[PDB]
Amino acid sequence: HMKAVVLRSFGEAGNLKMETMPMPRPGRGEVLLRVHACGVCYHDVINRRGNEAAGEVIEVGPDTPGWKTGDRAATLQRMSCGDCALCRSGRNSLCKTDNRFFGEELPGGYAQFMVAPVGGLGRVPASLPWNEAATVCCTTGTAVHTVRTRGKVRAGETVLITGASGGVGLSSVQLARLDGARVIAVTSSEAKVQALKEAGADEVIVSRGLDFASDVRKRTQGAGVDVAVEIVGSATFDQTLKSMAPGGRVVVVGNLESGMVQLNPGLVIVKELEILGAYATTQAELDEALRLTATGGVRQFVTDAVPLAEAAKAHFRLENREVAGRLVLVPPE
Amino acid sequence: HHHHHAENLYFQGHMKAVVLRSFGEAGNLKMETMPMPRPGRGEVLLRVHACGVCYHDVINRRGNLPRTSVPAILGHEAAGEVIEVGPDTPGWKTGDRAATLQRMSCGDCALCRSGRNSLCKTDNRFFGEELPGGYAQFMVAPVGGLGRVPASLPWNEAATVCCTTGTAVHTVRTRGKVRAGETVLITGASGGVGLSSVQLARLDGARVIAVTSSEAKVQALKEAGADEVIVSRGLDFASDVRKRTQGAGVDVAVEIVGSATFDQTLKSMAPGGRVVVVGNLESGMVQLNPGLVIVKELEILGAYATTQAELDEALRLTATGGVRQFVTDAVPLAEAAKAHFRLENREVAGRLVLVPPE
Ligand SMILES: [Zn+2]
Ligand SMILES: [Zn+2]
Ligand SMILES: [Zn+2]
Ligand SMILES: [Zn+2]
């Protein structure tokens, strides 16, 4: 047997039912994990309507060479098949052969136990506390795919980050600076200014999302930034494109839920801007994200740890924007 | 000082040229007798045999280009003959065949050194705006803004290459990087840029799917190298492409129309596809949906202007036949007003050319 939180009917935050469930058994090329912590990012609130954890390896399944008992591991969000045309090409976030996503087709991490294939796990260094390790893939893990893999930030470039207050934002500020770039952060609240500074931001602009283009210009000596991390949800797109320098790059990341944004094709044309989608974290990207966390080059900002039984209270605090940071669910022993 | 006996330089005096002395209606264009320009250091004097009429010229004529100033000689799509060179013109001699770009480029800033001449800010002078255009028998041109016309290419066809096949090279190759085997979606394929893009894509070993508004514009696009053609105003072709592509989508899309077809273009893209945006005919804004760009990791690339190398290549493609030129009517220079009227009222399908008198 095994204790877990289950959702059988979409709707309200209180529908997350603590059902006693059976323990899963790993198949060929799979492993059983004892969940020590599991983060709640707003994508789960989206899944709570109709539209990220870490633990110890206790039982290894057949055809699992690299892994043993007691090994530390953290899970991605999207499973990725091995050898397709896009995987061998490095475009693992677009594979359709194995589109399995944790918390959906594969049992989520709201359980004391869970199984995961080999390719969907990243080794967690021994230095990492479990709470912080469970919030890496959807913060720093997304930062690696956005800042490095897709955006390809280079030392000597200036990066704009809209909606910089958040899991992906604060990790993108750190990583972009760690790779030798200057960081201009845009936030909506004065309170989030000091955090962005402590995270390494060279400039922090407080804007509702319709007036910062000029300030980003004055701060770049009229040149404009080379890269933009567009974290949708703040109504900032028009000002972002105007903040770009000629040939600048805009890497779009965020949730599907946010409405359509204001696009002026003229700006893209005459400035030859590159708007790039950035989606899923790769196993290699997660391994790097976990290292950068152990290293100290990219921190985590855990607001509070919550018992797994209180999963309904977690989604409520996250639904009403009554939290600043990333909450974690700890299953009982 | 500097006395000479050259009869040809002495004859170089006055010239015929369409002059615009007040921005406004097409009728403000009037042939006049102007003094010939003199080429200076790094410049070249051209004997214009033809100048393409680009709708850009219409906007310019109305005063909607801020840096243009009356009196003005319009036109940026000129093809002519080098009759005189100034000092520091090592690659250019009298008798050479040249065609002007749209705008200049300094060649020294980081952007220029990177091949991004379209984005140069230090020298953004346009032909027919800050410096005189091709609506005339002669014009001066910095060597940096000239492309070479093969001897096998007539003037009329050459005077319409920059703003069609020239743009196609920049869009399809330099920016789009279309590779043989990919499926290419082209909107507004029936236009000047579209027709050149269709040919250039089919020439690069790619399957071309054209989307035209005209119902009976298919016989040309098909003959132009298009494997598939779709008739649509721009709101219902997305599903038709997914049907003609076995539900896979397209690898790259050449968005010439812009806002009118953009939302459907995106939905028509395969995972990891890239949209190369070059035009926005209706000047309308777009409601971009982030989810489709993210989940599929799509790329939206802008393409602007043409470089000296791209025009040399575009001109070469027309002389060889890889990308034909569809010149409707050749019009005397003195009838520039009539040309704009035709172009404004959409009463023409193809490219118009102004031929200066001898
Ligand atoms: Zn997550
Ligand atoms: Zn795959
Ligand atoms: Zn330059
Ligand atoms: Zn033009």
Residue A167: give its domain's CATH number. 3.90.180.10
Which ligand is the nearest neighbour of the Cα of A43? Answer: 1
Determine whether the interchain pair A272/B121 forms a contact, defined as Cβ–Cβ distance below 8 Å: no
Closest CB from B278, B286, B290 relative to A254:
B290
- Pick the closest to residue A175 from A142, A205, A131 (CA basis): A142
Smallest CA–CA distance, residue B184 to chain A, in Å, is 19
- A81 in a known ligand binding site: yes
Residue in B109, B127, B121, B112 with CA at minimum distance from that of residue B43: B127
B297 contacts A277? CB cut-off 8 A: yes
- Does B258 sit within 8 Å of A265, measured CB to CB? yes
Resolution (A): 2.5
By C-alpha distance, which of A311, A268, A293 is closest to A135? A293
User: Distance (Å, rounded) from C-alpha B209 to C-alpha B252?
Assistant: 10
Question: Residue B185's beta-bridge partner residues?
Answer: B209, B253
Residue from the list B295, B299, B303 with its beta carbon closest to the beta carbon of A276: B299
**C-alpha span between B77 and B54 (Å, rounded):** 8
To the nearest whole Å, the CA of B125 is away from the closest chain A CA by: 15
- Contact yes or no for A188/A206 (Cβ under 8 A): yes
- Closest alpha carbon to A329 in A171, A150, A69, A130: A130
Q: How far is the CA of B310 from the centre of ligand 4 (A)?
A: 15
Distance from C-alpha of B169 to C-alpha of B276, rounded to nearest angstrom: 12
Q: Which residues of B touch A150 (CB under 8 A)?
A: 297
Show the 3-state SS of chain B: CCCCCCHHHHHCCEEEEEEECCCCCHHHEEEEEEECCCCCCCEEEEEEEEEEECHHHHHHHCCCCCCCCCCECCCCEEEEEEEEECCCCCCCCCCCEEEECCECCCCCCHHHHCCCHHHCCCCCCEECCCECCCCECEEEEEHHHEEECCCCCCHHHHCCCHHHHHHHHHHHHHHCCCCCCCEEEEECCCCHHHHHHHHHHHHCCCEEEEEECCCCCHHHHHHCCCCEEEECCCCCHHHHHHHHCCCCCEEEEEECCCHHHHHHHHHCEEEEEEEEECCCCCCCCEEECHHHHHHCCCEEEECCCCCHHHHHHHHHHHHHCCCCCCEEEEEEHHHHHHHHHHHHCCCCCCEEEEECCC
Total domains in the fold of chain A = 1
Q: Give how far B286 is from chain A: nearest CA, Å.
A: 5
Q: How far apart are the C-alpha atoms of B259 and B231, rounded to whole Å?
A: 17
**Cβ atoms within 10 Å, residue B311:** 27
Binding site members of B for Zn(2+) = 54, 76, 106, 109, 112, 120, 163
Residues 6+ apart with CB under 8 A from B237: B211, B230, B261, B264, B268
Q: Please indicate whether, in this complex, the C-beta atoms of A278 and B286 are within 8 angstroms of each other.
A: no
Terminal C-alpha separation, chain B: 33
| Sequence positions preceding breaks in chain A, C–N over 2.5 Å | 51
A38 is in an annotated binding site: no
CA A130 / ligand 2 centre spacing (Å): 29
- CA dist B23 and B28 (Å) reads 7
CA distance B81 to chain A (A): 31
- Residues of B with CB below 8 A from A236's CB? none
Structural domain boundaries, residue A7: 1-333
Closest of A300, A299, A294, A302 to residue A128, by C-alpha? A294
Contact residues, chain A to chain B, C-beta under 8 Å? 86, 91, 93-94, 96, 150, 232, 237, 246-247, 252-258, 260-266, 268-279
